[PDB]
Each structure stands twice: as C-alpha cells, then as structure tokens.
Amino acid sequence: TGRPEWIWLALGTALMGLGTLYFLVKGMGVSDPDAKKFYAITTLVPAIAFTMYLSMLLGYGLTMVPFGGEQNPIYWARYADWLFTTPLLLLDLALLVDADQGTILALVGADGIMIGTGLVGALTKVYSYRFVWWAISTAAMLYILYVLFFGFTSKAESMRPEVASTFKVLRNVTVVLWSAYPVVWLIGSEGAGIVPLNIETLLFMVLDVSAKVGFGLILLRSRAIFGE
Amino acid sequence: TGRPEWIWLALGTALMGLGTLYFLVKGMGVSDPDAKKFYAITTLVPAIAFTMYLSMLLGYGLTMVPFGGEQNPIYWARYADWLFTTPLLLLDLALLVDADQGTILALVGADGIMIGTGLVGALTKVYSYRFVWWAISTAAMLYILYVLFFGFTSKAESMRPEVASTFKVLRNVTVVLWSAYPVVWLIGSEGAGIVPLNIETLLFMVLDVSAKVGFGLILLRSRAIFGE
Amino acid sequence: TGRPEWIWLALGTALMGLGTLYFLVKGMGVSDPDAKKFYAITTLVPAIAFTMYLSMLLGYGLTMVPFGGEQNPIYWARYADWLFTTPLLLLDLALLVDADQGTILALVGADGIMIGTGLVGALTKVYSYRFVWWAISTAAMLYILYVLFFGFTSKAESMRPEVASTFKVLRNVTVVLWSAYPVVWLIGSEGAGIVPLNIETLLFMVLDVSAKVGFGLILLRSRAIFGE
Ligand SMILES: *C\C=C(C)/C=C/C=C(C)/C=C/C1=C(C)CCCC1(C)C
Ligand SMILES: *C\C=C(C)/C=C/C=C(C)/C=C/C1=C(C)CCCC1(C)C
Numbered sequence: 037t038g039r040p041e042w043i044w045l046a047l048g049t050a051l052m053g054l055g056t057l058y059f060l061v062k063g064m065g066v067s068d069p070d071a072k073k074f075y076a077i078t079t080l081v082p083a084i085a086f087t088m089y090l091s092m093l094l095g096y097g098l099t100m101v102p103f104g105g106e107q108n109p110i111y112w113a114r115y116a117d118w119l120f121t122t123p124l125l126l127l128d129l130a131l132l133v134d135a136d137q138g139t140i141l142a143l144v145g146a147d148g149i150m151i152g153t154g155l156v157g158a159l160t161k162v163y164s165y166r167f168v169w170w171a172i173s174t175a176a177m178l179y180i181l182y183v184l185f186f187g188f189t190s191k192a193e194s195m196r197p198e199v200a201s202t203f204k205v206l207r208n209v210t211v212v213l214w215s216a217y218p219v220v221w222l223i224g225s226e227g228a229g230i231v232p233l234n235i236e237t238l239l240f241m242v243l244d245v246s247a248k249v250g251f252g253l254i255l256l257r258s259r260a261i262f263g264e
Numbered sequence: 265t266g267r268p269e270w271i272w273l274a275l276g277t278a279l280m281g282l283g284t285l286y287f288l289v290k291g292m293g294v295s296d297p298d299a300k301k302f303y304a305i306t307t308l309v310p311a312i313a314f315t316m317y318l319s320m321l322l323g324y325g326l327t328m329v330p331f332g333g334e335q336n337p338i339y340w341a342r343y344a345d346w347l348f349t350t351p352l353l354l355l356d357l358a359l360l361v362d363a364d365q366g367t368i369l370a371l372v373g374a375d376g377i378m379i380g381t382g383l384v385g386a387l388t389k390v391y392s393y394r395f396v397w398w399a400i401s402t403a404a405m406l407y408i409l410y411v412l413f414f415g416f417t418s419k420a421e422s423m424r425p426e427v428a429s430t431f432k433v434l435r436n437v438t439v440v441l442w443s444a445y446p447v448v449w450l451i452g453s454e455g456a457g458i459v460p461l462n463i464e465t466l467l468f469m470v471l472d473v474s475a476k477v478g479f480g481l482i483l484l485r486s487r488a489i490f491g492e
Numbered sequence: 493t494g495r496p497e498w499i500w501l502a503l504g505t506a507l508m509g510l511g512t513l514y515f516l517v518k519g520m521g522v523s524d525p526d527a528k529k530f531y532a533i534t535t536l537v538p539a540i541a542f543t544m545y546l547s548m549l550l551g552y553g554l555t556m557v558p559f560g561g562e563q564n565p566i567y568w569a570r571y572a573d574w575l576f577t578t579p580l581l582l583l584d585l586a587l588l589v590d591a592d593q594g595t596i597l598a599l600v601g602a603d604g605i606m607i608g609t610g611l612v613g614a615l616t617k618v619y620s621y622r623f624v625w626w627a628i629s630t631a632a633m634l635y636i637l638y639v640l641f642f643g644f645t646s647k648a649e650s651m652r653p654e655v656a657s658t659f660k661v662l663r664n665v666t667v668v669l670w671s672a673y674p675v676v677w678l679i680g681s682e683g684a685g686i687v688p689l690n691i692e693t694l695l696f697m698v699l700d701v702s703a704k705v706g707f708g709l710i711l712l713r714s715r716a717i718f719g720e
C-alpha cells in the first residue's frame with residue numbers, strides 16, 4: 037500500500053514536472069500556428085500527469101477496494117490522468133496526419149470507453165467481474181490501434197514525407213507502450229495480483245514517462261510539426 | 265432493487281451491444297468524410313450506453329439514496345450514459361442541418377444542465393427538493409426542444425431536400441422520446457414512486473434503445489448523411 | 493457551516509438566475525453568427541453558476557473535510573461551477589481576439605489544472621498539503637494571466653479597434669477579479685481559516701457575480717461582438 041512504492045511515485049512526479057518545464061521553455065521559441073498546437077497539446081500531457089502523480093505520492097489519489105476477500109489499495113488517480121492525457125496523445129498523432137474530424141471523434145470516443153471501463157474494473161467489488169471490464173477496455177484499445185494502422189498509417193503517406201516517417205515512429209512507440217498497460221494491470225494489484233503493487237507502480241511509472249515525456253521529445257524535436 | 269429489473273437491464277445491454285456492432289460493421293463501408301462523422305457519432309452512442317447498461321446489470325451503477333424516509337435504490341449510471349450520449353445525438357441533428365457553432369454550444373450547454381440537474385435531483389436527500397431539480401432540468405429540456413423547432417427546423421429547409429425530411433423525422437422522433445423521460449422519472453422510483461423500479465427500468469430501456477439504436481437506424485440508412 | 497452564509501448563497505442564486513434570464517431575452521434579438529457565439533457562451537456561464545449556487549443553498553454542494561484537527565465544511569459545488577465557467581469566460585476572450593487553436597487549448601488546459609488542483613486542495617486531509625495544491629493552482633492561474641497579456645494583448649491590437657479596447661477592459665476586469673480568488677481561499681475556511689465561512693461565502697459571491705454577470709454585461713453591450 038501507500039509506502040514501499042513511494043519512490044517510484046516521487047520519481048514519476050519529478051520526471052513529469054521536469055518534462056513539463058522543459059517543453060514549456062522549449063515552446064517559448066515558437067511562432068508557427070501549427071507548431072503551437074503541437075506544443076500546447078504535448079506540454080499539457082506531462083503537466084496533468086505531474087499533478088496526478090503528486091496526488092498519488094501524497095496519498096490523495098489512493099483508495100481501498102474490497103474484492104477477492106481483501107481490502108485492496110487502488111490508485112484511482114491514474115485514470116483521472118489517463119482520461120485526459122491519452123486522448124491528447126491521440127490528438128497529436130491525428131493532427132500530425134491531418135485526420136478528418138470523423139476519425140478524431142471515433143478515437144476520442146474509443147479512448148474514453150477504454151479509460152472509463154478500466155476505471156470501473158479497478159473499482160469493481162466482484163473479482164471475476166473485474167476481468168470482464170478489462171476485456172471490454174482491451175477491445176477499445178485494439179480498435180484504437182487498428183485505426184492508427186488501417187485508418188491513419190495509409191494517410192500519413194499521402195502527406196509530406198517528414199510527416200510520414202515521424203508519424204510512423206510515434207505510431208510504433210504508441211503501439212508498443214500502450215499494449216503494455218493492459219498486461220501490467222492484469223498481473224498487478226488491480227487484476228490477478230501476481231505482481232506486488234510496488235513493482236506494479238514501477239512498471240506504470242516507466243511506461244508513463246516514456247509515453248508522456250519520451251513521446252513528446254521525439255515529436256517536439258522533429259520538423260514535421262512545422263508548416264513546411 | 266437490484267433483482268426484479270435484471271431482465272430489462274440484460275436486454276438493454278444486449279440490444280445496445282448488438283446495435284453498436286451493427287453500426288460498426290455497416291460503417292466499414294464508408295469513405296465519404298461527412299458520412300464518416302455521422303457514423304462515428306452514431307456508433308459511439310450505443311457503445312457508451314452498452315457499458316453503462318452493463319454496469320447497472322452487474323450492480324456497479326446502482327446506489328442507495330435516503331429520502332422520504334426510506335433507502336431508495338438509484339441507478340446513477342444512467343446519468344453517466346445520458347451526459348455523453350444526449351449531446352452526441354444533438355450533434356448528429358446539428359451536423360445534419362449544418363448549424364452554426366453558436367447554436368451547437370447552446371444545445372450542448374443546455375443538455376449538460378439538463379443531465380447534471382437531473383443527477384442532483386436523483387441523489388437529493390430532501391424529497392421535496394428533488395422536484396425542484398426536476399423542474400429546472402425540464403426547463404433545460406424545453407429550451408433544447410425549442411431550438412430544435414424554432415432555431416433548427418427553419419434551416420434544414422434552407423438546405424437540401426433530403427436533409428430537411430430526414431431531419432424532420434429525426435426531430436419528431438427526438439421530441440417524442442425525450443419528452444417521455446421526465447414523465448418516467450416523475451412517476452418512478454426517482455420521483456413520486458407511483459411506478460415500481462421494475463417497471464421504471466423497463467420504460468427507460470425501451471426509450472433508450474429507441475433513441476439510441478432506433479434513431480441511429482433511421483439516420484444511417486438515409487442519403488442525407490452523404491455530401492450529395 | 494450550512495446556516496449563517498445562507499443569505500449570500502440565496503442572493504447569489506437569485507443574481508445568477510436573473511442574469512441568465514436577462515442574457516437569454518437580450519440574445520433573442522440576435523441574427524449575426526459570431527454575435528450568437530458570444531451570447532451562447534456568455535449566457536451559459538450564469539446558468540451553470542445558478543445551478544451550483546442553488547445546490548449550495550439547498551445543502552447538496554456542501555461536504556465536511558477533516559484536517560488541522562477539525563471537521564471543516566467545504567462547498568465543493570464551487571469547483572463544479574468553476575470547472576465549466578472559467579474556460580467559457582476564457583473562450584469569450586479568445587474568440588474576441590480571434591486566438592489560434594493552439595493558445596485556446598493551452599488556456600483551457602491550464603484552467604483545468606487550476607480548478608482541478610484547487611479542488612484537490614479543498615478536499616485534502618493533511619493541512620500543510622492543502623497549500624501545496626494552492627501554490628500549483630496559483631501557478632496555473634499566473635500562466636493564464638501571462639498568456640492574456642503577453643500572448644493575447646498583442647493580437648487584439650493587430651485586429652479591429654473596438655475589439656482591442658473591449659478586450660482590454662475585459663482583460664483588466666478578469667485579471668483583477670481572478671487574482672482575488674486565491675487570496676480569499678487562502679484566508680478563508682479552505683486555507684488558513686482567518687476569515688469565517690460566512691464572510692468567505694460573501695466574498696466569493698461578490699466576485700462570482702462580477703465575473704459572471706458584470707463581465708457579461710460589458711461584453712454583450714459592446715459592438716465588438718458583431719462582424720463589423
Ligand atoms: C498516459 C499515457 C498512456 C499512453 C496511458 C495509456 C493507458 C492505457 C492504454 C490503458 C489501458 C487499459 C486497458 C486496455 C485494459 C485494462 C485497464 C487499462 C485502463 C490499464
Ligand atoms: C440516451 C438518450 C436519451 C435521448 C436520453 C434522454 C434523457 C433525457 C431527455 C432526460 C431528461 C430529464 C429531465 C427533463 C428531468 C428529470 C430528469 C431527466 C435527467 C430524466
């Protein structure tokens with residue numbers, strides 16, 4: 037519970053906060069309208085995660101959920117972070133390839149379902165039911181990945197070269213990191229409990245920084261964000 | 265409480281889920297940008313309701329509220345469904361007639377107030393106060409219906425013929441179904457308690473499927489969704 | 493707690509409600525597309541505050557929070573009001589100067605952080621931690637004010653004259669009123685408790701009406717809202 041994993045929470049808080057400041061400073065030197073959208077979106081991601089990481093570190097974003105026959109510590113603040121940051125990350129990818137509003141809404145909607153059902157599963161009191169919510173959330177995640185490959189990948193190409201390769205790298209990064217979340221949830225304290233909360237927190241922290249800050253570094257360092 | 269009405273909840277879950285899949289498959293054959301917006305919006309509606317129906321069926325979206333001198337079972341998950349699905353349905357209507365952003369914001373805002381105040385009323389502990397919230401929510405609903413007739417109906421016409429007639433039918437469907445919700449709430453467990461929760465659940469399920477799936481069928485089967 | 497301050501809550505409810513109706517009637521005489529956006533945004537602000545003021549008056553938007561060694565009455569409904577009304581007010585300012593989407597997202601995001609962290613601080617059980625959240629929220633507020641002066645003020649000018657002067661006055665009003673909120677929070681029941689809840693409620697009510705209704709009056713009475 038709220039002790040062993042404090043170091044990963046403090047490290048996560050520090051890393052999000054440092055990334056936010058870096059992106060903020062880096063973005064000061066920005067005039068291009070479109071480059072500005074990418075900077076605004078990308079800087080807000082770590083800023084939000086920073087606040088939620090801090091809430092968990094201080095104990096606010098933690099709650100106890102009874103199931104399986106025990107009082108299980110559940111960090112609900114994560115979902116609070118994910119509800120806003122994941123759609124923003126998807127927005128960066130969509131703006132990059134200039135997706136139509138229809139596909140953007142589909143991605144945002146699928147993302148809301150993924151995080152929402154993930155939260156319902158995290159707070160469910162009937163053990164077996166938790167995995168039903170996990171499956172539904174996972175289906176929503178696969179839909180998103182499908183759109184990113186069969187509804188996006190085919191358009192980045194019909195666009196500028198630099199936009200295509202940058203999108204391809206960010207797309208690959210997203211697919212790899214995002215797919216790991218359901219696995220961590222399944223084996224950790226929220227699911228089967230095969231991995232202790234301490235290790236679970238460490239895993240999400242590494243994933244969260246790589247998806248928030250790592251992702252932002254790649255994106256904000258490319259010329260794909262400027263109007264040619 | 266959480267037993268007799270299980271069948272309507274299970275039927276509702278199944279019907280939303282089937283509608284979502286149908287719209288998903290049907291939309292695979294879609295290239296037109298605008299047709300895509302209508303499919304994305306319309307498919308997300310049943311998808312959300314599906315998750316909330318399931319949460320109620322499993323018991324997660326149910327809570328007890330003390331008032332009138334009793335512990336009353338209240339399915340709060342409904343509001344959670346309504347908060348997102350009603351504005352999306354209004355968006356379908358607005359896109360159809362190509363409404364201006366000003367009117368869209370007014371509708372979305374009025375809708376948020378309608379659902380929000382409806383939720384406050386559902387969870388209020390002072391019996392008489394529940395109806396004050398019901399009245400305010402009902403006023404917000406009338407505003408929406410007013411805009412749909414005196415701020416929309418007059419524009420669908422100044423547009424394409426097929427757009428006008430389709431909008432007219434969907435407009436009529438909406439007015440009829442939506443107006444029934446406050447009545448059901450008033451006579452059911454949330455309000456006067458003249459109708460038992462069992463029958464109340466049945467009523468909302470029939471209304472919810474007709475407004476979510478029935479509405480989508482009419483819309484997604486018309487040529488009004490394509491750019492001529 | 494829920495008694496002495498009832499008059500300020502009732503006065504606040506009445507003033508928001510009257511402002512909403514006034515703006516609604518005033519806006520009936522509106523055809524211009526852009527003028528419509530300003531009316532829709534501006535009328536929704538008092539409408540939302542009206543509902544939240546009423547929830548506090550009736551006792552629904554009030555909760556008890558343990559900290560410092562006492563059971564402290566906290567009106568959480570305020571944040572619920574602020575989460576939606578502050579970004580809408582910022583939207584009025586942004587539309588006025590025709591800000592780019594990038595800056596709009598930055599303002600909305602910073603605003604969400606400001607209100608969200610303010611709420612976490614309001615509900616925090618560890619006294620000293622409450623001020624950590626206050627500081628973070630205050631930093632987010634300063635960012636917003638910075639953008640309004642160094643990212644907005646310089647563009648209203650490169651626009652129409654009437655737009656510039658109206659923006660300047662609304663900008664000034666915002667800076668003055670918004671800066672007062674963190675001070676009231678710090679000295680009131682949410683913070684140091686130097687000022688009683690009764691006086692705290694009075695202060696927020698005066699600020700809330702001036703920022704919601706006062707602000708709307710200035711804006712909706714200017715020619716800057718019309719397309720020349
Ligand atoms: C903050 C950044 C990212 C990329 C967060 C991503 C989170 C997910 C993709 C979470 C997915 C879940 C699934 C598919 C099912 C179990 C519950 C989760 C919400 C962890
Ligand atoms: C899911 C689809 C629809 C069309 C849901 C509609 C819901 C309403 C129009 C609810 C309205 C309410 C009112 C006017 C007052 C009592 C409380 C309600 C939230 C049920």
Ligand SMILES: *C\C=C(C)/C=C/C=C(C)/C=C/C1=C(C)CCCC1(C)C
Pocket residue numbers: 573574577578581606607610611626627629630631633669670671673674677700703704
């Ligand atoms: C309803 C209208 C307005 C203008 C409300 C404004 C509210 C704020 C600017 C609140 C700011 C806060 C800060 C900076 C730190 C303490 C907590 C608050 C949420 C009160």
